[PDB]
């Protein structure tokens, strides 16, 4: 069952995709509002996908090991020069996970979009499936891709200060390594913001 | 029935799974409005209290089923043990604006009193946590959170009830532990 | 026997895991046991059946004693939790403090 | 034990300096490793714990690399209480835990 993402102008085609979940929502609430008085421009220009590594899986690591990861994060590209030429701006998140083995080797690592993240202490873990999510194991799918809209407690907000959405990686199940299974399996993200707007150019030096 | 699973869609099998013929549900007292419009205690409390929301103890009801949402949007009864004047305002106002006292005051009562005060923070909808740092690394909620600030020139009690309130966005609710047992073995009414 | 107990600050010894290492005279060390919160142990194969080990669930308090405690061995010993309440290996819990 | 590190390294405060710890597919290629910290006092304050994070409640400078077959260590500048006895420590696929780190005395030059 395959799956063919695209934005922008970059794909990422992944057959083991097992389905897109949406976060909260299946579109975005209105843009125009009464701040910013309708200046808005959406810029479709950063809608690429960019890599990010993230925590290794180990076959060591137990239930529980969080890796977060920050959103939106350090990025250096044309979203970046965004983020810093620009005041305001607004985006829904289209994450996609990819965790590949050799199909040998048995662990559920669940992945979820967490908002307006903050340390869990070892009881809330558990309940950490609240929010949305999907299980990337090495048996059925190597992929999730989740895509969330933008919500915070404005309409848009400075990214330098507020970050909302934060990529949790929780472990739910320790990798098992067989011998034809791969000891170590990497985790990388396509992330890629969606229906980015802006607003109010800044002076830049 | 086993579905995929992993894909994380939200499936559900009743009894009919085994010749089960389900009962009917009625889930009102589990309703976000209802469980939200009964009263809750605020401790502690001191002359020139911010009435800000998630003040509240945790274990309480009010209080951890609005920590079991990310944002929330509610109208506030409070209800204030007073011994003087009692002066409130909204979220976006100056320490000095209570004395006057036009901003809306209550005088003493002989029980204690009861006042509407309505929403008035100019977030879109307000939060239990804010990652992310403050304005100008903490998660330390901001300012503008709090719905207003009383003073009177003493409080000996404090009480507020959420009217009309909407939950988003849902949290982990975190029951309490038990070890060495399995069920918990409170003392039962 | 050498029992050098360390009681824990708050940190609920209930949902906490915890590890002894002993660093030996100048820089030297080696994982004494550790034992998973839910009265699971794990301690180094090699230096068994004369540690005593177990976790006092209610008065934050971890036992460990040592027999045939020698000359040879002494060291500035430590007591540390680890982030995690069980480990999958009984050797992997040094990685994570 | 096997997880060999160099005994000294040389640094300086002003530039990065990094510590190497080499082991194979064993040891590291697949388990992670962890940074421990130890001024001439004493202590286990962790640099680098699961290879890649460092606990709450140290700078961020101290950055943990788990690349190729050896954790490395890099401190992105250096102090003058930067100097210690950093330590490489993880377990061993077919053998005991092996927390064997020489220990890299450090220097501020």
């Known amino acids: 069952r395959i799956l063919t993402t695209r934005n922008g102008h970059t794909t990422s085609t992944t057959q083991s995709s097992v389905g897109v979940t949406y976060g909260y929502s299946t579109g975005e609430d209105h843009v125009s509002g009464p701040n910013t008085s309708g200046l808005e421009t959406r810029v479709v220009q950063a809608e690429r996908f960019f890599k990010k590594h993230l925590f290794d899986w180990t076959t060591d690591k137990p239930f529980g090991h969080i890796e977060k990861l920050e959103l939106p994060t350090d990025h250096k590209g044309v979203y970046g020069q965004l983020v810093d030429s620009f005041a305001y701006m607004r985006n829904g998140w289209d994450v996609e996970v990819s965790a590949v083995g050799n199909q040998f080797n048995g662990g559920c690592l669940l992945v979820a979009m967490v908002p307006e993240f903050k340390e869990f202490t070892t009881r809330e873990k558990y309940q950490l499936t609240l929010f949305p999510h999907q299980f990337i194991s090495p048996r059925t799918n190597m992929t999730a891709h989740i895509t969330v809209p933008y919500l915070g407690v404005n309409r848009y907000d400075q990214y330098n200060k507020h970050k909302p959405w934060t990529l949790v990686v929780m472990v739910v199940s320790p990798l098992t390594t067989s011998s034809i299974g791969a000891s170590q399996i990497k985790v990388y993200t396509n992330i890629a913001p969606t229906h980015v707007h802006v607003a109010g150019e800044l002076p830049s030096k | 029935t086993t579905a995929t699973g992993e894909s994380a869609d939200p499936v559900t099998t009743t009894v009919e799974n085994y010749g089960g013929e389900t009962q009917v549900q009625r889930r009102h007292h589990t309703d976000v409005s209802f469980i939200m419009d009964r009263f809750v205690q605020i401790k502690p409390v001191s002359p020139t209290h911010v009435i800000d929301l998630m003040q509240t103890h945790q274990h309480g009801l009010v209080g951890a089923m609005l920590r079991a949402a990310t944002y929330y949007f509610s109208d506030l009864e409070i209800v204030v043990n007073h011994t003087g004047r009692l002066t409130w305002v909204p979220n976006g106002a100056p320490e000095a604006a209570l004395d006057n006292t036009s901003n809306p005051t209550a005088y003493h009562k002989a029980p204690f009193t009861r006042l509407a005060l309505p929403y008035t923070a100019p977030h879109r909808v307000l939060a239990t946590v804010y990652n992310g740092n403050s304005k100008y690394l903490a998660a330390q909620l901001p300012a503008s959170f709090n719905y207003g600030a009383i003073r009177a020139t003493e409080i000996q009690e404090l009480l507020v009830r959420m009217k009309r309130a909407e939950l988003y966005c849902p949290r982990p609710l975190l029951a309490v532990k038990v070890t060495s047992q399995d069920r918990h073995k409170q003392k039962i009414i | 026997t050498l029992s050098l107990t360390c009681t824990v600050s708050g940190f609920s010894l209930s949902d906490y895991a915890v590890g002894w290492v002993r660093q030996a005279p100048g820089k030297a060390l080696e994982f004494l046991g550790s034992?998973?919160?839910?009265?699971?142990?794990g301690y180094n194969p090699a230096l068994k059946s004369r540690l005593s080990i177990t976790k006092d669930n209610s008065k934050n308090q971890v036992s460990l004693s040592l027999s045939s405690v020698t000359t040879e061995d002494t060291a500035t010993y430590y007591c540390?939790?680890?982030?995690?309440?069980?480990?999958?290996?009984?050797?992997?819990?040094?990685?994570?403090? | 034990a096997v997880l060999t590190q160099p005994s000294s390294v040389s640094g300086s405060l002003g530039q990065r300096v990094s510590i190497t710890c080499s082991g194979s597919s064993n040891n590291i290629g697949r388990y992670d490793v962890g940074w421990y910290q130890q001024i001439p006092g004493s202590g286990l304050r962790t640099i680098i714990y699961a290879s890649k994070n460092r606990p709450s409640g140290v700078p961020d400078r101290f950055s943990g690399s788990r690349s190729g077959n050896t954790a490395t260590l890099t401190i992105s500048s250096l102090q003058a209480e930067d100097e210690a006895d950093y330590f490489c420590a993880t377990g061993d696929y077919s053998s005991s835990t092996s927390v064997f780190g020489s220990g890299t005395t450090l220097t501020v030059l």
């Open positions: 034992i998973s919160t839910g009265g699971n142990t």
């Open positions: 540390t939790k680890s982030i995690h309440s069980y480990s999958v290996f009984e050797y992997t819990y040094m990685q994570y403090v």
